[PDB]
Amino acid sequence: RRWFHPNITGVEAENLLLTRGVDGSFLARPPGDFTLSVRRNGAVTHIKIQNTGDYYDLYGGEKFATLAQLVQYYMEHGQLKEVIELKYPLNCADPTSERWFHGHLSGKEAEKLLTEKGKHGSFLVRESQSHPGDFVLSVRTGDKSKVTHVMIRCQELKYDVGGGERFDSLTDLVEHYKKNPMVETLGTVLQLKQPLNTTRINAAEIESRVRELSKGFWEEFETLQQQECKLLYSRKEGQRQENKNKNRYKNILPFDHTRVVLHDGDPNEPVSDYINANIIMPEKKSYIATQGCLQNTVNDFWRMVFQENSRVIVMTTKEVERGKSKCVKYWPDEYALKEYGVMRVRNVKESAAHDYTLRELKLSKVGQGNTERTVWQYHFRTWPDHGVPSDPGGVLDFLEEVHHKQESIMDAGPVVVHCSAGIGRTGTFIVIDILIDIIREKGVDCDIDVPKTIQMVRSQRSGMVQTEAQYRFIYMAVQHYIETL
Structure with a gap:
C-alpha cells in the first residue's frame, strides 16, 4: 500500500511523477477528499476521489469499499477514462503512517513506553536527539527483559545501522531487519515482532x-x-x-x-x-x-x-x-x-x-x-x-x-x-x-x-x-x- 503519500502536496506529486516516474506511474494523496495522480504521455492527470461516509466514489469511475480495492480494480481491469493506465505505483518513503514511527522522542521516554506497554519484539523508530537527521530503532526483548537502541544513520538520503546495506527509506530498513534480525556479539536476537x-x-x-x-x-x-x-x-x-x-x-x-x-x-x-x-x-x-x-x-x-x-x-x-x-x-x-x-x-x-x-x-x-x-x-x-x-x-x-x-x-x-x-x-x-x-x-x-x-x-x-x-x-x-x- 506504499502508493499512498499522506503528506505530499499537488506540485510535489507532479514533480515526483515526472522525475522518478514513467508513463503509468501513479500515487494517491489526501475534508475527506483524495486525489489519484497518474503519469500519461509525459503529463500528470488528477482524478478526484470523494468519500461522504458511505463509500469511495471515483469521479467518472466506480464506487469502492477501500482505496486499495479501487487501486486493485483499475490495475487489473480500459475502465478508467477521462484511457488512463494504472501500471507502476510510486512508493512513499515517508514513515508517518507506520505504527512503529514516533519522530521527536528521547531514549528514556522510548524506554518508559516500551516498559509500560511493550513485550518481546516490541519496537519503535524515533528521531535521534544527539545526531540530528539520524534515527534510532528501540527494541524490547525478554519474557528479565531489556530495551536495546540501534543507531540508524541518514547518509546521502539513504539509511543504514552502521554497516552492510543502505536503504532508500526507513520502511525498507525496518522490513529488512524484520525478515533478517540483527544478532548481538553475545547472541541476543533483535526480533522486530510487533510495533x-x-x-x-x-x-x-x-x-x-x-x-x-x-x-x-x-x-x-x-x-x-x-x-x-x-x-x-x-x-x-x-x-x-x-x-x-x-x-x-x-x-x-x-x-x-x-x-x-x-x-x-x-x-x-x-x-x-x-x-x-x-x-x-x-x-x-x-x-x-x-x-x-x-x-x-x-x-x-x-x-x-x-x-x-x-x-x-x-x-x-x-x-x-x-x-x-x-x-x-x-x-x-x-x-x-x-x-x-x-x-x-x-x-x-x-x-x-x-x-x-x-x-x-x-x-x-x-x-x-x-x-x-x-x-x-x-x-x-x-x-x-x-x-x-x-x-x-x-x-x-x-x-x-x-x-x-x-x-x-x-x-x-x-x-x-x-x-x-x-x-x-x-x-x-x-x-x-x-x-x-x-x-x-x-x-x-x-x-x-x-x-x-x-x-x-x-x-x-x-x-x-x-x-x-x-x-x-x-x-x-x-x-x-x-x-x-
Whole structure:
C-alpha cells in the first residue's frame, strides 16, 4: 500500500511523477477528499476521489469499499477514462503512517513506553536527539527483559545501522531487519515482532486523549488505513454472475469466510444462498452488517432475519437521500400484514421518538404459526446526508435502547445493522456499540483501543468505518458515554 503519500502536496506529486516516474506511474494523496495522480504521455492527470461516509466514489469511475480495492480494480481491469493506465505505483518513503514511527522522542521516554506497554519484539523508530537527521530503532526483548537502541544513520538520503546495506527509506530498513534480525556479539536476537502499541488507553484517559487528538485524529486514522492490505480475504461469491444484481454497489462485497449463508432456498433457484451481509463477532452480542434492501433482495433479507433468529434491526438511513433510493421499504405499513416470499411480516405498532422510529414487527414462516417471533425495527432518521451528527447523545440514547431490547430477549440472534452499502454508518454504529458494551460492563476500569477494534471488525467486512469524521465521532461518542457514568 506504499502508493499512498499522506503528506505530499499537488506540485510535489507532479514533480515526483515526472522525475522518478514513467508513463503509468501513479500515487494517491489526501475534508475527506483524495486525489489519484497518474503519469500519461509525459503529463500528470488528477482524478478526484470523494468519500461522504458511505463509500469511495471515483469521479467518472466506480464506487469502492477501500482505496486499495479501487487501486486493485483499475490495475487489473480500459475502465478508467477521462484511457488512463494504472501500471507502476510510486512508493512513499515517508514513515508517518507506520505504527512503529514516533519522530521527536528521547531514549528514556522510548524506554518508559516500551516498559509500560511493550513485550518481546516490541519496537519503535524515533528521531535521534544527539545526531540530528539520524534515527534510532528501540527494541524490547525478554519474557528479565531489556530495551536495546540501534543507531540508524541518514547518509546521502539513504539509511543504514552502521554497516552492510543502505536503504532508500526507513520502511525498507525496518522490513529488512524484520525478515533478517540483527544478532548481538553475545547472541541476543533483535526480533522486530510487533510495533509498540500507542492507541490502547484506559477509559478514564479518553478526555485527555481526545484533547491531544484535537490538537491528530487524521494522523491516527491514516495509520489505521495503511493496514487495510493486511486483510487478504476472498470476496468471490459476490462476484458470481447470479449474485451480481444482489449487491447494491457491484464492487462493495462481503468476505466469503464471514458471509451470511442462506439455507432452505427455493429448489427451482440455482443460487439462493446469497445475501450481501457479514457476521460481526467482537474479538457478548454479535452483529450482521448488511446493505439496504434492493427490490429483488427483500425476500432474502427476511430469510436471513428468520434463519439467524435476529430480534433487533438497526436502520441508519432514510429510504431516500438526495433523491436516491438507499433502501427499499422491506416492512408493512402500520397494522398491515405482508408476505415476502415464504416469510410473513406484520407491523404491530410504530412508536416515534425524536431521533428514531421503532416498529414492532411480527415475523413467521407461511404454513407454520408457531414460528412467530417479534422483531423490533429501530429506524434512526436524523443522521445527516453527508458527514456525522454534531452531538453523539442521540446515537448513544438510541444504542442504549437497542442494547436493552436485545438483552431482554432470551437466545436472540445477532443485531442486524444496515445503511446504504453497509460499511460506513453501519461500521460506526457497530464499533461504538462494541466499545460502549465494554464501558457498560467494566466502567472506567477497562482499556479501549479504537483503531484495534475497527481492524478486528474490518477483518470480518471490508470498509467498516469509512471516514475520519466517523472515526472522530466514535471517540466523541465513547467520551460522551464516559462523562455520563
